[PDB]
Amino acid sequence: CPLMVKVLDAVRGSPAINVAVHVFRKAADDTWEPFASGKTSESGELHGLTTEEEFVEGIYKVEIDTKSYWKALGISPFHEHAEVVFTANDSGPRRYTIAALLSPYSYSTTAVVTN
Amino acid sequence: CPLMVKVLDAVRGSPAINVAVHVFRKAADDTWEPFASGKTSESGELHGLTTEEEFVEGIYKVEIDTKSYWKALGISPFHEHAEVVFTANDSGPRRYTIAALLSPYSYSTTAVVTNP
Amino acid sequence: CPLMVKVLDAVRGSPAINVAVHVFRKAADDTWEPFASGKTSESGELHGLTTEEEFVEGIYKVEIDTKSYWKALGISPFHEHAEVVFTANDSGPRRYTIAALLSPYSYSTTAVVTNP
Amino acid sequence: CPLMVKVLDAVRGSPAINVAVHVFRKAADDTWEPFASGKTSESGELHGLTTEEEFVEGIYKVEIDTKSYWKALGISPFHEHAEVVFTANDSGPRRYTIAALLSPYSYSTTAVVTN
Numbered sequence: 001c002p003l004m005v006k007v008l009d010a011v012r013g014s015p016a017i018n019v020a021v022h023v024f025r026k027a028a029d030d031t032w033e034p035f036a037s038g039k040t041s042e043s044g045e046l047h048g049l050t051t052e053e054e055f056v057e058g059i060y061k062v063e064i065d066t067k068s069y070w071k072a073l074g075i076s077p078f079h080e081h082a083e084v085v086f087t088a089n090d091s092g093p094r095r096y097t098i099a100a101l102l103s104p105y106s107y108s109t110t111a112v113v114t115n
Numbered sequence: 116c117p118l119m120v121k122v123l124d125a126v127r128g129s130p131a132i133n134v135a136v137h138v139f140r141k142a143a144d145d146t147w148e149p150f151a152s153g154k155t156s157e158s159g160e161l162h163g164l165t166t167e168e169e170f171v172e173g174i175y176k177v178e179i180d181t182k183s184y185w186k187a188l189g190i191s192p193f194h195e196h197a198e199v200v201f202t203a204n205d206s207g208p209r210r211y212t213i214a215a216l217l218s219p220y221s222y223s224t225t226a227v228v229t230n231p
Numbered sequence: 232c233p234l235m236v237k238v239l240d241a242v243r244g245s246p247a248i249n250v251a252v253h254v255f256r257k258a259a260d261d262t263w264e265p266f267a268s269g270k271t272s273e274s275g276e277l278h279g280l281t282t283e284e285e286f287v288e289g290i291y292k293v294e295i296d297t298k299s300y301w302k303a304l305g306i307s308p309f310h311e312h313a314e315v316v317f318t319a320n321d322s323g324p325r326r327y328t329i330a331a332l333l334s335p336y337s338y339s340t341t342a343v344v345t346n347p
Numbered sequence: 348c349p350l351m352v353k354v355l356d357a358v359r360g361s362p363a364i365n366v367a368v369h370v371f372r373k374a375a376d377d378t379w380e381p382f383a384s385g386k387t388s389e390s391g392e393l394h395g396l397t398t399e400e401e402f403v404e405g406i407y408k409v410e411i412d413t414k415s416y417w418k419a420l421g422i423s424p425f426h427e428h429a430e431v432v433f434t435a436n437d438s439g440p441r442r443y444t445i446a447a448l449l450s451p452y453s454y455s456t457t458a459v460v461t462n
Contacts, residue, residue: 106244
């Protein structure tokens with residue numbers, strides 16, 4: 001599991017469950033090509049987005065549908081979505097946990113890069 | 116004026132100075148069209164990006180070039196930038212302060228939205 | 232002046248208004264002795280807590296009563312307060328902005344430290 | 348495991364390893380009585396602080412020795428330590444994950460309260 005997304009809800013103090021997450025890889029013409037997606041689990045986690053072989057070096061965007069999340073909770077969100085854009089190495093894998101802490105008008109994202 | 120970007124460096128406890136900030140507005144159309152850009156001042160603030168009249172309803176993207184910031188300080192950061200995307204002025208003109216707090220492997224962004 | 236506390240509400244995207252803030256300084260002695268206190272204004276800022284001369288070297292504790300803030304908005308928050316503890320003026324007088332960004336189950340605090 | 352502490356390093360994008368954490372419970376005379384402590388593991392986590400029976404309702408302080416952490420990494424920290432003070436319920440357990448994201452001049456703490 002080279003890429004994992006964990007999303008937390010700072011309002012409810014809970015995993016952010018059922019948050020849509022899209023992953024894009026930057027194509028040669030600089031467009032975002034869809035790569036992977038899923039919804040965060042009961043634990044606010046999204047595993048199995050990619051595999052080591054598929055998760056090559058490149059620029060990746062993780063788009064977290066924070067707006068729909070806040071919408072479902074009846075809370076006015078500010079952001080359309082939380083985007084995390086990063087280069088996957090050099091030098092090598094490396095597992096990536098993209099942690100997002102969500103509030104209606106604020107989010108943080110943190111990369112926990114291990115091995 | 117109606118849009119300000121304030122950037123802090125969570126490593127130094129300082130304004131993040133000379134941080135490039137690009138603002139885009141989503142067109143008809145769905146493409147991001149260049150709206151405004153600037154750099155943060157010595158206070159980490161970027162003022163004067165737009166005017167109440169120019170800053171109409173829309174979906175705006177504020178792209179903060181955090182990577183160049185960190186790289187100019189010798190740090191290979193995780194993120195390419197900090198991008199903040201939001202609908203502005205949906206229920207009337209507001210002032211938006213887009214705050215980013217930067218760490219090499221983390222940023223937060225906070226919107227402070229006021230009336231006018 | 233040398234110490235300012237700025238509090239934001241990450242749920243509303245607003246200054247956190249009327250937030251009680253208590254500042255303590257560690258005495259000789261190891262006890263926290265009451266240094267200053269105040270409430271945040273409509274800008275979420277608390278100015279005038281101290282003066283350069285009063286704000287000497289020390290370990291300071293800024294206790295932000297986030298609980299009362301959230302509870303006055305109907306929310307049972309997680310934290311009792313946001314407490315920021317730091318050594319001030321170790322290498323000379325500085326200006327300290329203590330920023331807190333509040334969510335019912337999370338806060339961040341950021342120090343912006345400048346010269347003078 | 349009713350109380351868990353997870354600490355992340357926003358500078359290195361890594362678990363904050365070997366971070367001293369003290370847990371205090373507020374005594375009747377409002378003093379902080381030491382309750383539990385440990386050091387975050389390789390995964391930036393600290394488990395086994397307490398048990399359901401011992402982790403009664405009360406006001407608890409989790410003190411995270413962020414300063415020594417930054418000291419060991421040769422980075423000037425601002426804070427003496429990250430303190431998290433909270434009431435353990437009502438109404439009941441409930442597992443508490445106290446997540447702290449650390450930077451030299453900023454930290455966030457988030458409570459992930461489940462069940």
